[PDB]
Design an enzyme around this catalytic site. Structure first.
Site, short mmCIF file in Angstrom:
data_model
loop_
_atom_site.label_atom_id
_atom_site.label_comp_id
_atom_site.label_asym_id
_atom_site.label_seq_id
_atom_site.Cartn_x
_atom_site.Cartn_y
_atom_site.Cartn_z
N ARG A 97 0.95 6.89 0.02
CA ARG A 97 0.02 5.87 0.45
C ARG A 97 -1.02 5.72 -0.65
O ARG A 97 -1.57 6.72 -1.14
CB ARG A 97 -0.66 6.30 1.75
CG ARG A 97 -1.84 5.43 2.16
CD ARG A 97 -1.40 4.10 2.72
NE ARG A 97 -2.44 3.34 3.41
CZ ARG A 97 -3.45 2.68 2.88
NH1 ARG A 97 -3.66 2.66 1.56
NH2 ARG A 97 -4.31 2.03 3.67
N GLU A 138 -0.71 -6.18 5.19
CA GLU A 138 0.59 -5.52 5.18
C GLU A 138 1.72 -6.47 5.59
O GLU A 138 1.48 -7.47 6.24
CB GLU A 138 0.58 -4.29 6.08
CG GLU A 138 -0.44 -3.25 5.61
CD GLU A 138 -0.70 -2.22 6.70
OE1 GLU A 138 -1.83 -2.18 7.22
OE2 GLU A 138 0.24 -1.47 7.04
N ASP A 152 -7.04 -0.99 1.16
CA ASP A 152 -6.35 -1.56 2.28
C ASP A 152 -5.77 -2.90 1.85
O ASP A 152 -6.59 -3.76 1.53
CB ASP A 152 -7.28 -1.83 3.47
CG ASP A 152 -7.55 -0.56 4.24
OD1 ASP A 152 -6.63 0.29 4.30
OD2 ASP A 152 -8.67 -0.43 4.77
N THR A 153 -4.47 -3.02 1.85
CA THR A 153 -3.84 -4.30 1.51
C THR A 153 -3.49 -5.02 2.80
O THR A 153 -3.26 -4.34 3.81
CB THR A 153 -2.55 -4.17 0.70
OG1 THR A 153 -1.64 -3.29 1.40
CG2 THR A 153 -2.77 -3.48 -0.62
N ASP A 206 0.81 -1.21 0.00
CA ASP A 206 0.00 0.00 0.00
C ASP A 206 0.85 1.27 0.00
O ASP A 206 0.27 2.38 0.00
CB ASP A 206 -0.98 0.00 1.20
CG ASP A 206 -0.30 0.11 2.54
OD1 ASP A 206 0.94 0.13 2.64
OD2 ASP A 206 -1.00 0.18 3.58
N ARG A 252 2.49 11.26 4.46
CA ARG A 252 2.51 10.52 3.18
C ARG A 252 1.55 11.12 2.16
O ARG A 252 0.43 11.46 2.55
CB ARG A 252 2.13 9.07 3.42
CG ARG A 252 3.02 8.32 4.41
CD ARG A 252 2.57 6.87 4.45
NE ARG A 252 1.28 6.76 5.14
CZ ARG A 252 0.67 5.62 5.43
NH1 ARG A 252 1.22 4.45 5.10
NH2 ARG A 252 -0.49 5.67 6.06
#
EC number: 3.1.31.1
Length: 136
Positions: free
Chosen positions: A30, A38, A35-36, A16, A82
Site C-alpha cells: 500500500r 480507487e 489516498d488515491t 494506491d 499489506r
C-alpha cells in the site's frame, strides 16, 4: 535512517496498491501517506479519477528499470497484511508523483510513519495551486 531496498514488479493493482516481489516473496504494498481515488473501493466502486490514478501508477512502475521500496520508521504492514512503504521508480517516488499531479491527496497521517509528510504536503499544495485533476 530510511533505506531503499530493491524489489521486482509483479502487478499493479490500483492507484494506491502494487504487488511486488520483495526478498523473494510476493507481497502487496500500500503506498504510504496518500489516498488515491480507487477503482476497487470497498463501497463506492470506481470513483472519479480512479482509472486515471490507476493508469498513472501502473505506467510508472511498468516502465521502470529499477523499483525500490523504502519502509518508514513505524509499523511496516497494515491490518490487511499489506506492506506500508514509499515506492520509487528509477529514483522517483511514486507516492509524490501522484500527489504532484493531483491524482492523490495526502492521507490522514499516523506517527511515526510520517517521514516524508512535509514533502508530500508541499507537492499537494502545488497541485492545488495548479488546479490539476482532483483539484480542477
Amino acid at each position: 535512517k530510511l533505506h531503499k531496498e530493491p524489489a521486482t514488479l509483479i502487478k499493479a493493482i490500483d492507484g494506491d496498491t502494487v504487488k511486488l516481489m520483495y526478498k523473494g516473496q510476493p507481497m502487496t504494498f500500500r503506498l504510504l501517506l496518500v489516498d488515491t481515488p480507487e477503482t476497487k473501493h470497498p463501497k463506492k466502486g470506481v470513483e472519479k479519477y480512479g482509472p486515471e490514478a490507476a493508469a498513472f501508477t501502473k505506467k510508472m512502475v511498468e516502465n521502470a528499470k529499477k523499483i525500490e521500496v523504502e519502509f518508514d520508521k513505524g509499523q511496516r504492514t497494515d491490518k490487511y497484511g499489506r506492506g506500508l512503504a514509499y515506492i520509487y521508480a528509477d529514483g522517483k517516488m511514486v507516492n509524490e508523483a501522484l500527489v504532484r499531479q493531483g491524482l492523490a491527496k495526502v492521507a490522514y497521517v499516523y506517527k511515526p510513519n510520517n517521514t516524508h509528510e512535509q514533502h508530500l504536503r508541499k507537492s499537494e499544495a502545488q497541485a492545488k495551486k495548479e488546479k490539476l485533476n482532483i483539484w480542477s
